[PDB]
Symmetry: D2
Subunit: 294 residues, 4 copies
Amino acid sequence: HHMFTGSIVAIVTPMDEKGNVCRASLKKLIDYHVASGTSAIVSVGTTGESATLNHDEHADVVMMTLDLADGRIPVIAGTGANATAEAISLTQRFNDSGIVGCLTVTPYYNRPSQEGLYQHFKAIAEHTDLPQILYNVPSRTGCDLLPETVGRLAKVKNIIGIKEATGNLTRVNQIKELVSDDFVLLSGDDASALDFMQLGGHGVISVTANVAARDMAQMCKLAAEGHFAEARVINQRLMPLHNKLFVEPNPIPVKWACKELGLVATDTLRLPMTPITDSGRETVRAALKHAGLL
Amino acid sequence: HHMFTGSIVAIVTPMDEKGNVCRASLKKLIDYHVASGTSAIVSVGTTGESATLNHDEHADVVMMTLDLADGRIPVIAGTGANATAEAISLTQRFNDSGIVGCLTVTPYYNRPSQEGLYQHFKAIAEHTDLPQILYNVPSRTGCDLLPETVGRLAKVKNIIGIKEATGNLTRVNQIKELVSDDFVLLSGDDASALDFMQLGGHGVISVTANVAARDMAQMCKLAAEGHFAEARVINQRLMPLHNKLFVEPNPIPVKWACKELGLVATDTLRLPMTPITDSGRETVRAALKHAGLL
Amino acid sequence: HMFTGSIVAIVTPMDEKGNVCRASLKKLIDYHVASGTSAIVSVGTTGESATLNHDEHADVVMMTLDLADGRIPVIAGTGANATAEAISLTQRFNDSGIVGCLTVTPYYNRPSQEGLYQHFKAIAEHTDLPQILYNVPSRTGCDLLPETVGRLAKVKNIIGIKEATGNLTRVNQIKELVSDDFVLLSGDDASALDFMQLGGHGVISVTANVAARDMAQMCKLAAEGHFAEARVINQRLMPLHNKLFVEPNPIPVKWACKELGLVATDTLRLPMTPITDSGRETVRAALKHAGLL
Amino acid sequence: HMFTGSIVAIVTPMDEKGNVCRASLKKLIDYHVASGTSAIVSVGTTGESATLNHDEHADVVMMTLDLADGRIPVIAGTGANATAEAISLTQRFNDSGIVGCLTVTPYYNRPSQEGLYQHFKAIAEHTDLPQILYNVPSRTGCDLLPETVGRLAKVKNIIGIKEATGNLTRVNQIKELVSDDFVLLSGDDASALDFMQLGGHGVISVTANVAARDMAQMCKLAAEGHFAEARVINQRLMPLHNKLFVEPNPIPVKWACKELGLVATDTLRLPMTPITDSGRETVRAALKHAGLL
Ligand code: NA
Ligand code: NA
Ligand code: NA
Ligand code: NA
Ligand code: NA
Ligand code: NA
Ligand code: NA
Ligand code: NA
Ligand code: NA
Ligand code: NA
Ligand code: NA
Ligand code: NA
Ligand code: NA
Ligand code: NA
């Protein structure tokens, strides 16, 4: 449980101008999260450009993140794939790496059934001893892992939680009532995450935490302590970021914000991500200023 | 133009019981399409389980399909990827293969902007002499290539057409009016394909054509000749298949139907596709019987 | 024949007090007679059916009939979300001179397919007037499906449908369930030409309020299979087709009517409010695109 | 305080002719008094507002007030899609004894945020009675957004909202724009407990028609922060929360009322039709799950 709760950053993969991982920038981010009280780092999720790294660069970024973390902050590896054999293969690369767990997205594009999702995640879970956090994000995947199937999978010993990114807050108690008390419920939607914690959620895997780590850590700890009015004060400060970090496709805005705050050298991404527009720059700058970060 | 019109089959990748390509079954399918008057074969699209073949098996199936075709029927290679560098790499593998063109899906999962889609397809187009057919399917990808961006891309010399799979028939004339007369408009939605041709579409890339090739060839030729009442007679025969081939995730139903008609040895798929349910079997059998195929 | 081509969903022109302005309605009806409009729908959605009581509703229909003076057929809006009120409103127009009724699926109370069947069947049985069913789920919360249209088409004086989903798959789904003389009309200007090209017989049009000559020409060209020529007209009308909804209908089309000199006042009843500055600029650019300004 | 907890959207019980059945309404109101229901909404959606004319509407509200006899507060449904009709209906209840009005966003005519503002502001200015705004886009075609709720909350007798989207992000979006005594009520039974846990003050409930004791207990436990205990009740009510909509509301809840002996007849007005065999079996299994049968 506890390690997989609070503010978990869906960390950018900072790049040089050629699109290659920038170690010095990642080191700065990881020292930042250690200092800020971030609970854990998700390495090569969606915000980390999993889509545009091959499995070798993917593995390199995860092992680099672990190495820079140096035991100071838990690392969760993104291990999602839309082929079950590939998800198992990617998961096996990190067995005994030192990561504490895996974040495994529902297959994207091929739109499996609820039985396909069950057989997919069960097969992955049987090929590792690592804790598995299911990841539901239908806007990106074209499929919806429903609470009934979550309940089914929760019975598998090392399936320990879900990163629910629908923004549909009815999912919190629909899942909670089909699962044991130590099954972890994490928001994957920054704008609705405090609401998600107020309904019983245990934390959030956050893009906003990339640039407001100390605020996001404080908001999740206040939510866990049941101080929701104090948590809402931080959430109101952060809400323009929660929204405007998606004004253009994630992670285009958050990489620009990281660069503007001096957290990374370069806001470079890989195609088909393209540089932030003038209009997006002014929108994200107004949001950083609203959060008191600029 | 003409080669990229009429009934184009989105061909299954027939597998043995281990999930490996079955050459004897693919040979039977390809001789079937030659005999039936199918215009062309799309090799390793969505129906061909692109999602669960690695790029090496992908390349093998395409080269196998070309080899079995033996010049008798044009082959279009599925070349889609959600990373631009990977789309270019996959496209380069088929340069000078003998395929006549590429079917290239909008990046899935990473949800690029209209400018990201432009820069993605333009970069691919600049790395080949092969004709490129854009593929829009938001239900699977999480993004929507809009007519405005299609018009932009149509100006690139070897971007020659789109496989519009929204089922939104307003797209036909929205695209047609932004593009030249020889820009190819193909339905990617069997249930709405005749409607799509009646509005100006030039053909369809079809799952139904896998099991009703001669009917689908005849329906597209009648539509092209402007005999829509005669085309609707075939479409009414086929409509339960057009729908029920999606009763469970494609290609689970069409692989079962292919096996039941004796067109392939095995209906085996790769996870996260799972075997057809009892209920799906009886639904697809009733649909085959309605089309007069059983 | 009378239920095909360009049918205007005519505005109820108002004075500044929100009362029907006969002189403006006379000018609109003369304009439709001169432009080749096939028929007038009186007090549909575009006619502010929502904000007229049944007495003002009946008066506007009787005024429209009187002004038409046999020169152009009049179809009455007769919709209601209570079946007893639909019958009662329908019974007011029996022997009025209207050629038919446009009857929307009940809004707000979200009936079943069986409730829609019983609703339209009851209405049809209380009149000899032809009935055109009207599907517009975006306004009603309710979707009359092709299967239920097929069921209703068997009732003698249920003669057609205004299909306002903008879902063009409904044309051949309905057409294959109904007789060859069941009339298919678009209720969606932006997709109407597409609708006719798939086999629709006409449109009940907001755009035809201000581009009646172009809308009559486009529907006639489509009916004769001159689609290339019909697409040229649709391209010059497409900004109106879209921007007449840039604010709630009929706020833009009433402003356009006034701007072209077709009506004295762009006045509406609450909860419709005056067109915004941004709206005026959008609608003026669309009128200019159509060659009307 | 009076606008919090479990508020029943009460059925208008009918005889077989479709007329209000006073003896059945008396038994429902005695039942709500005995069960701890906080208040009655009279002639809302569940009360078939759509199929009663304004005279029958007023009679049902006056009958409900009379039967309540000061034992339980009565809130009148006063919604209309024409602002002049909303004012007129509201003016009928001034000095009636109702404690407040529930006024739905105009349905069918799809006004702007500015039109909704002018609609509710005009209504509020023609009464001293508290106004509860009612957002239900699935029925209306119209979505009253938090920003517009904030604007309206500044008008003295606009005191709260029934938020029936089932979108739980609206609770804190509205709450941060309005004063601490602006009342937030769920209009969606299946998500009501969630709504209260995010800071909502109560629910206007279909389920409370047949599980009034459980619904009062769940809202009171939620208000006191006994969520574990409130979730146990929600779990035994969840099949009713969902299956009372298995057919159009109020077809299932009227059948459930009759089956429990709370009303004489499950009769409705067209276009509502009798519950299907499949519906009866679904609703009976849900009543049994709730321990009511
Ligand atoms: Na990144
Ligand atoms: Na971002
Ligand atoms: Na396949
Ligand atoms: Na299939
Ligand atoms: Na009007
Ligand atoms: Na006309
Ligand atoms: Na309705
Ligand atoms: Na249409
Ligand atoms: Na308008
Ligand atoms: Na009722
Ligand atoms: Na109660
Ligand atoms: Na509305
Ligand atoms: Na709710
Ligand atoms: Na009900």
